[PDB]
Ligand binder design. Structure first.
Ligand SMILES: Nc1ncnc2c1ncn2[C@@H]1O[C@H](COP(=O)(O)OP(=O)(O)OP(O)(O)=S)[C@@H](O)[C@H]1O
Ligand SMILES: [Mg+2]
Lengths: 646, 268
DNA sequence: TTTTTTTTTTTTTTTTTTTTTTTTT
DNA sequence: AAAA
């Protein structure tokens, strides 16, 4: 039904004019004829005859390649979507390979549209007809959408070779007013206007009877009076008001920045969807707007900065397995999608260089994807009633959260922490607006030289937690006796972050590590057995437990004795214990009404017939009360990751 | 390809005219000449042949000097990010060393621009024409940028010889509305209006065929009717609301006062 | 727990309109 | 000179 499409849509025929400029080898290329049929698939569905016409377009080997081959990709499912290239991109392949003939095709294209309107209304232009001409001419560059509060917001696609803020190439940007459209409607639209002027004068040159003696003269007078209308301001404001509907595109704002496999970079957009990661520095159709100003380059260990960073980094963390495991964890900061609930906190001392690593990642990732949050938030000690809260926000879309030191060692209640790590959704509010929910997908790190008090026993609480301790410390007198001591550079933090190449080198390392973990056991973090890690963590679990310490301080090593009333004094005995052993405090005592049974006291803990859980015997201690009776060091390179054991 | 240089771009031919009347002693010297090479290189990369011809202004340096070194300098300036010294500076040296000649050159330039618009639209001026003509002159001052709050903001370059605040000289200042731009467009633009009127009446003086019996009469009537528009409040407000698009400079507010090696003082 | 966020603006007209002199009756 |  080629004729059908021809008559059904003049644009379809124009679209046919433009597709005739494609060389036959384009139709030969297997992934390309799949691309074009998919591109037309997402734009309407009645173009099956046109798609079938494309099967007969340069069919030098259609029978050789299979008659039921190109149509099969569309006839198998006229429904269904793939989130692929739509229209307004086929024009890009058309003009990138067939110049000149493309510019005249579009030139006569809107020329017919404009010349139709000038004849139909005796040369009396208006706002809407101009808006239609503009959209058919530069409708493949602008998108208008409506935000949450509701205004007609303008988004512009940046192209190389035009004034633009650094790092904002090959991606959409927000515009308060389409300013460059205002100059565009005044300069390039004039050229279209002139072609009309020549056409009417040429027809006036050809003699004829009264049908042209006054009719052409009237239009010329009307047209010239209307020629100056375009330069007016209120008229130009009206055209922008009209064109808002033509450039309207439903479902564009909420699909912005949704793909977690696309990252905006200073030299295009970086795709981590497939291995290896690929850089896009040409036209595409992915709705991405946020970015960071760090240019991406392929990972080269031969760069002096890459070696410089790797050497200092390797010295910072001595253990090979710990070094691999930590950076693999930090490599997830590039990802912006759902992540497994892992909390990383680790201990150090003095000028340990902890601040250097967090600071490096934050600027490398950029503000759009990384941010600094109040350390108090981690404590979770603070509670928020029905009141605005801002620091809870800012976590949207981010993939990295880093903290700093506290006043001292701090206690962290499970509340306000369970939802900070879990792959769930949380809701809150702040200045203005109201309650709203947002998916949390950011990696979390918080290291300090202060131990974090944890008062619980639940496995679910102590399953999304990992602990580490630093061992290498920096001092200005590095005696050559202790390996855990190295010299410092004041420039190392004050500068070396201001060098863009350092960020470019560091970002490459992060990309490479994420590729390694992805090429590793299908992602995930639970694997990679680092004996140094997860052992100090459970050692920290054997510590940081007041009850267990109390158990093997007063009742254990003296269980054969018998000074027991009930669960009541055991709490008081535990109360006075932590009062001195730790600090004086009180609790709604029901926690031990079951935790004590959850403990190892069952040897003597047996509930009496009238409940009271009378322990079979212990010795409450007063006065001194003693004598109571009861890895491979890497050869030369470790970023190469070594074989599977590593 | 000098003909290609002078063909595709009237801005290039204007830069050709400005490139003349220069003190070639500076071109002979390495520092200042390299500085102006950097200035022109930072202003787009499409002007590679024009920069090459700038190497052939007083060709002695291109015949006695680092030819390949100079072209490599221009190339690296094109593909590097620096402080980005731009135009409106070579204009400064041209005015500094060479008064007179440049004044009538720019006068003829924007006068020709306005005359071209008048002849194109039968002397029916409109806000865009006046806005572009105004941007053709001035331009050095009046940088416009969009704040973080979404409000257009105007900035003026303070110069000696005006009523300014204390210690505000030789640096940008914030302006709620370009008031002295308003009075400038009211006063100085009238000189161009008068020059155009004189040119029209002079052409009317010369005798010709039936064109002058009615056609110049129509042109002069339309121009006279449009003359009073520049004094209208709504017309001038529209002219400003059109012109702030042209004087827009991307990435200006956030890069303001960023340099820690520069201090603002009373005497500069 | 006010406190400051909330309130409460806050743009608020503006364009235009009319005419528009010329034109052409 | 008056109406569009
Ligand atoms: N890999 C490295 N190479 C060279 N110098 C380093 C390295 N790591 C740390 N340093 C030096 O040691 C210092 C870093 O320690 P600090 O940042 O002071 O300690 P921190 O644990 O990060 O937290 P602070 O700052 O002590 S509260 C810097 O002054 C660096 O000069
Ligand atoms: Mg530090």
């Amino acid at each position: 039904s080629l004729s059908i499409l021809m008559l059904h849509d003049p644009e379809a025929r124009y679209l046919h004019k433009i597709l005739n400029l494609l060389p036959p080898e384009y139709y030969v290329e297997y992934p390309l004829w799949s691309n074009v049929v998919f591109a037309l698939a997402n734009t309407s569905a009645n173009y099956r005859p046109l798609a079938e016409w494309f099967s007969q377009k340069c069919p030098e080997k259609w029978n050789t390649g299979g008659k039921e081959k190109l149509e099969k990709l569309w006839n198998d499912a006229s429904h269904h979507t793939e989130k692929k290239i739509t229209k307004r991109s086929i024009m890009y392949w058309a003009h990138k390979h067939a110049p000149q003939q493309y510019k005249e095709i579009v030139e006569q294209g809107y020329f017919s549209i404009l010349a139709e309107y000038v004849y139909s209304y005796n040369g009396m232009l208006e706002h809407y007809m101009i808006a239609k001409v503009i959209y058919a001419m530069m409708g493949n560059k602008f998108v208008v959408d409506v935000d949450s509060n509701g205004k007609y917001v303008w988004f512009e696609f940046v192209l190389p070779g035009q004034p633009m803020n650094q790092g904002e190439i090959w991606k959409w940007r927000k515009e308060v007013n389409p300013d460059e459209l205002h100059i565009y409607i005044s300069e390039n639209f004039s050229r279209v206007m002139d072609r009309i002027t020549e056409h009417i004068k040429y027809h006036l040159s050809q003699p004829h009877e009264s049908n042209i003696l006054n009719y052409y003269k009237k239009l010329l007078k009307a047209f010239e009076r209307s020629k100056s209308k375009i330069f007016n301001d209120s008229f130009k404001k009206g055209v922008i008001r009209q064109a808002e509907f033509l450039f309207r595109q439903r479902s564009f704002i909420q699909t912005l920045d949704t793909n977690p496999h696309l990252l905006g970079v200073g030299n295009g957009v970086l795709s981590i969807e497939t291995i290896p990661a690929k850089l896009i520095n040409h036209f595409h159709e992915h709705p991405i707007h946020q970015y960071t100003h760090i240019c991406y380059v392929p990972f080269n260990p031969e760069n002096p900065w890459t070696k410089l960073l790797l050497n200092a980094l390797q010295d910072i963390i001595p253990e090979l397995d710990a070094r691999l495991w930590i950076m693999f964890y930090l490599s997830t900061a590039i990802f912006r999608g759902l992540k497994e609930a892992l909390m990383l906190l680790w201990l150090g001392g003095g000028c340990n260089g902890k601040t250097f690593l967090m600071r490096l990642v934050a600027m490398v990732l950029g503000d759009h994807y990384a941010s600094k949050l109040n350390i108090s938030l981690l404590t979770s000690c603070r509670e928020t009633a029905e009141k605005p809260n801002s620091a809870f926000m800012r976590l949207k879309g981010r993939g990295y959260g880093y903290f700093e030191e506290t006043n001292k060692s701090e206690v962290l209640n499970t509340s306000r922490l369970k939802e900070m790590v879990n792959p769930g959704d949380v809701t809150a509010r702040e200045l203005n607006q109201k309650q709203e929910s947002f998916q949390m997908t950011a990696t979390m790190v918080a290291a300090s030289n202060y131990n974090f008090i944890i008062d619980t026993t639940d496995h679910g609480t102590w399953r999304r937690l990992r602990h580490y301790r630093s061992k290498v410390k920096f001092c200005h007198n590095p005696d050559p006796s202790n390996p855990y001591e190295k010299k410092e550079d004041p420039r190392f933090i004050h500068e070396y972050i201001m060098d863009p190449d350092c960020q470019n080198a560091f970002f490459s390392i992060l990309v490479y590590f994420w590729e390694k973990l992805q090429k590793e056991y299908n992602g995930q973090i639970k694997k990679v057995f680092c004996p140094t890690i997860e052992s100090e963590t459970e050692a920290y679990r054997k510590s940081q437990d007041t009850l267990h310490r109390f158990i093997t301080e007063r009742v254990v090593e003296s269980p054969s004795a018998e000074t027991v009333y009930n669960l009541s004094e055991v709490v008081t005995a535990y109360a006075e214990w932590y009062n001195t052993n730790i600090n004086v405090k009180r609790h709604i005592a029901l926690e031990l009404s079951q935790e004590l049974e959850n403990s190892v006291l069952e040897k003597y803990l047996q509930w009496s017939p009238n409940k009271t859980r009378i322990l079979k015997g212990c010795r409450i201690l007063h006065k001194f009360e003693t004598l109571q009776p009861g890895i491979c060091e890497p050869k030369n390179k470790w970023w190469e990751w070594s074989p599977n054991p590593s």
